[PDB]
Amino acid sequence: MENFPTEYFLNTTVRLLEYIRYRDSNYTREERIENLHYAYNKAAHHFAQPRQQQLLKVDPKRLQASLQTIVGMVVYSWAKVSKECMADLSIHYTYTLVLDDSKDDPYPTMVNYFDDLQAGREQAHPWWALVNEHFPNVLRHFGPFCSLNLIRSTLDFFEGCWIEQYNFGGFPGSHDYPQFLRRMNGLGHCVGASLWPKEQFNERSLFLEITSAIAQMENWMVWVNDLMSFYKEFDDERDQISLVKNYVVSDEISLHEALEKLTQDTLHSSKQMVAVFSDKDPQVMDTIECFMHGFVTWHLCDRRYRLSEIYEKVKEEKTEDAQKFCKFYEQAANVGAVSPSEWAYPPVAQLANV
């Protein structure tokens, strides 16, 4: 495990993309930018308000980068929802991403969680205070069922962050620990259920397909995120408790074996996704198919994952996979690779100062 498994990585990646039919969409670069700028503009103004500014403990530059990555993720994956929906989901997912910067023990602020909740008093933990206060803007876009899924997944997310403050990969032999923790901090049900705005879908008529998407998208989403993150986290000694690293510690297997597990689950997850929704309702298969492709595009385009480093390395190779990878990467860059100066302005800090 000295060096990075570039060959293995390339094969698994090209396979993943072939399985999901990664291809070109009717989502034009011009539309991309209208959305990116719309979501960013509404969010930046939100996070620039004094209340948000004083209760949300985050370094200004990290908040700026966090918002930009999230807006990119939302706009590129929730392609079929409205501009307002992308904006509101962008705010919510930025809140969640930001919570990972807190090192503060939740205990003291969670001692009266239920009582304050039941009584209607503002939560003690400032994050819950801002988040529950803003939640209605996100929930108005969905039916009661989908809404409940968003509420629960976020609640799970809070506990996940809590557990992670312990930097615990699991007890050797605790095979059920890794995936339990990945579901906690994954936001699977939040993501999967937020793909169905009531304005475009009927929660009740499409109940079976919506529940199914949630169940399948949960695992596909987090595993693809783990896979595409495997490169940036490979030599990062700061990142110590990923799904893959916990598989090593908990299951007592080699990092390679852990990676093997992730690839098999991801590929299988991919096959079944298609095999199940291809014949189902077309509007649904469309939302699903666009999420998978955009999600992948976002990973390939965002610098956070540094996948450009892999492209640049295998750029001129005659191996089959290396080439397939580069074509895919170029496909992505074409619609995805966009300068931040084109939408992400002005910085949140400039708006907060005003």
- The answer to whether the beta carbons of residues 336 and 30 sit under 8 Å apart is no
Which CB atom, from 30 or from 237, has the smaller least distance to Mg ion? 237
Q: Which does 185 bind (CB under 5 to 8 A by kind): Mg ion, a second copy, none?
A: Mg ion
Which amino acid, 37? H
Comparing C-alpha atoms, which of 233, 154, 158, 228 is closest to residue 191?
154
Q: Measured on CA atoms in the order 170, 175, 178, 184, is the torsion positive or negative?
A: negative
- The answer to whether the beta carbons of residues 165 and 103 sit under 8 Å apart is yes
Out of 28, 60, 104, 117, the only residue in the binding site for a second copy (CB under 8 A) is 117
d(CA 306, CA 213): 29
Comparing C-alpha atoms, which of 292, 324, 329, 294 is closest to residue 309?
329
d(CA 300, CA 14): 12
Q: Which does 110 bind (CB under 5 to 8 A by kind): Mg ion, a second copy, none?
A: a second copy
Closest chain position to Mg ion (CB): 229
Instruction: Give ∠ CA 319-322-328 in degrees, rounded to 5.
Output: 140
The CB-of-155 to a second copy minimum distance in angstroms stands at 5
Residues 6 or more apart whose CB falls under 8 angstroms from that of 100 comprise 161, 164
Out of 149, 225, 269, 287, the only residue in the binding site for Mg ion (CB under 5 A) is 225
12 binds Mg ion (CB under 5 A): no
The CB-of-240 to a second copy minimum distance in angstroms stands at 15
- The answer to whether the beta carbons of residues 42 and 82 sit under 8 Å apart is no
Out of 37, 57, 100, 110, the only residue in the binding site for a second copy (CB under 8 A) is 110
Out of 3, 26, 118, 341, the only residue in the binding site for a second copy (CB under 8 A) is 118
- The answer to whether the beta carbons of residues 65 and 58 sit under 8 Å apart is no
19 binds a second copy (CB under 8 A): no
Out of 12, 194, 229, 297, the only residue in the binding site for Mg ion (CB under 5 A) is 229
The CB-of-223 to a second copy minimum distance in angstroms stands at 11
DSSP state of 341: G
Contact region for a second copy (CB under 8 A) — 77-85, 90-98, 108-116, 234-242? Answer: 108-116
121 binds a second copy (CB under 8 A): yes
**Catalytic residue positions, numbered:** 93, 96-97, 100, 182, 232, 304-305
- The answer to whether the beta carbons of residues 266 and 192 sit under 8 Å apart is no
Task: Point out which residues bind a second copy (CB under 8 A).
Answer: 106-107, 110-111, 113-115, 117-121, 132-133, 135-136, 139, 143-145, 147-149, 151-152, 155-156, 158-159, 162-163, 166, 168, 170-171, 173-177, 180-181, 204, 207-208, 211-212, 214-216, 218-219, 268-269, 272, 275-276, 280
Task: Point out which residues bind Mg ion (CB under 5 A).
Answer: 100, 185, 225-226, 229
